[PDB]
Design a protein around this nucleic acid. Sequence first.
DNA 1: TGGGGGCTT
DNA 2: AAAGCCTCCC
Length: 225
Amino acid sequence: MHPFVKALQEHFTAHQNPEKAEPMARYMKNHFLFLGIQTPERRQLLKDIIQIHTLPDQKDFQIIIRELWDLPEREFQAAALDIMQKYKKHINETHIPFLEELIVTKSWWDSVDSIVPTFLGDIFLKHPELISAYIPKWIASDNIWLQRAAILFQLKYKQKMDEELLFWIIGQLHSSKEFFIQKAIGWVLREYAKTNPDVVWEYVQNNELAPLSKREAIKHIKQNY
DNA sequence: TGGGGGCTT
DNA sequence: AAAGCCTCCC
């Protein structure tokens, strides 16, 4: 409906590439249709539409992102995320519910990981009191993408990592049978190990986790122990 | 296991 | 912009 979205849809479509669509789609296990438009082209095409229509008012950004999210081809969600980054300064704690919706719709690692450690990680840093309003809820939801969100929001924290909170969240999900949860646990631990390898090594040796998670967690540090 | 064209700095 | 890195994938 929104002219900006429809313009973007027609522009993207005119520049699709079936030869690139196949491998891109297979990378995501065929959960999505792809136009076959990679990042440099996708951003240029977005740029073109912005040059013509200009970037919409901040009070419209959510409608545009939702309309893009509803379109079949994956690049439209990738473009929606490019757009959200442009409005980054206007995204705050009142947008958590909107972000939850994006996380649980058209869900896969590519969209969820693009939302969580950046947007949500920044938000909880700025609004510490909201962690208890969201994280326990996400863990208990049995929606694996919200559960992944609770694990990964601190991914980029480095020295800001709240270790007790991290290990609490992991402990809550350590028995999950979900592939993308075991992976998220391994990832956050592997990433945090670049800052504090000793504590991650100890945690992995001394606590219950899926073998998958243990392997992912220590893949870069095992050479040191 | 553990390293990879597409992506990033 | 030369070169390191990889969520994921296999």
